[PDB]
Amino acid sequence: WLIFARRQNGPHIIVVPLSTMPAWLDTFEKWAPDLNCICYMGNQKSRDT
DNA sequence: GGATGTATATATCTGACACGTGCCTGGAGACTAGGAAGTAATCCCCTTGGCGGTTAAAACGCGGGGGACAGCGCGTACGTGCGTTTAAGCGGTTGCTAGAGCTGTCTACGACCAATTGAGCGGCCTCGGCACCGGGATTCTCCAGGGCGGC
Numbered sequence: 001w002l003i004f005a006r007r008q009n010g011p012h013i014i015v016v017p018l019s020t021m022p023a024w025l026d027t028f029e030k031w032a033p034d035l036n037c038i039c040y041m042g043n044q045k046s047r048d049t
Numbered sequence: 050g051g052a053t054g055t056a057t058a059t060a061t062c063t064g065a066c067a068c069g070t071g072c073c074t075g076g077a078g079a080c081t082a083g084g085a086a087g088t089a090a091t092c093c094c095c096t097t098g099g100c101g102g103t104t105a106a107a108a109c110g111c112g113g114g115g116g117a118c119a120g121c122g123c124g125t126a127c128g129t130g131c132g133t134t135t136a137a138g139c140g141g142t143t144g145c146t147a148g149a150g151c152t153g154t155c156t157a158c159g160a161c162c163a164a165t166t167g168a169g170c171g172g173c174c175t176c177g178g179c180a181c182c183g184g185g186a187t188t189c190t191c192c193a194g195g196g197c198g199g200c
Contacts, residue, residue: 017101019101
């Protein structure tokens with residue numbers, strides 16, 4: 001709603017526990033498929049990538 | 050029949066015990082002040098038993114070669130013994146000076162106490178420098194028009 005209706009489509013950050021974060025990723029894949037939701041975990045080279 | 054080995058007795062040497070004396074240092078008695086024990090409050094660090102996630106260190110295995118160790122040869126340098134020298138060790142001279150010990154006098158220097166104040170500790174405001182944001186100048190990629198060729 002913040003992205004589509006009010007046009008506030010800037011950088012949002014969601015900080016979650018690691019164990020629940022696949023349950024956030026598939027929720028973003030299902031409910032908001034048009035969004036550019038990215039994932040930020042891993043070692044130094046993955047985060048650099 | 051003479052001299053030798055051995056036992057008991059007597060005088061002398063020597064470490065130890067007790068007596069005597071000084072003196073000075075430790076003990077007894079009394080008084081006082083402050084060092085430390087005890088109390089309460091506040092705040093921060095440490096303890097024990099857990100969880101989660103990163104990740105680099107620890108562990109394990111394996112191949113291989115460098116290094117530890119053993120053996121052997123050799124030659125030199127150190128041990129050993131003897132003869133010779135030399136200097137240490139002891140006893141001794143001869144004076145003077147340094148130093149410990151004791152006594153005496155005195156004076157400058159440091160302890161002690163009261164009043165003071167200025168250097169040390171904490172916080173607050175500001176600057177030097179680094180960094181975030183807005184505006185101007187410079188260079189790169191691109192879309193369209195003009196001209197030429199083919200059926």
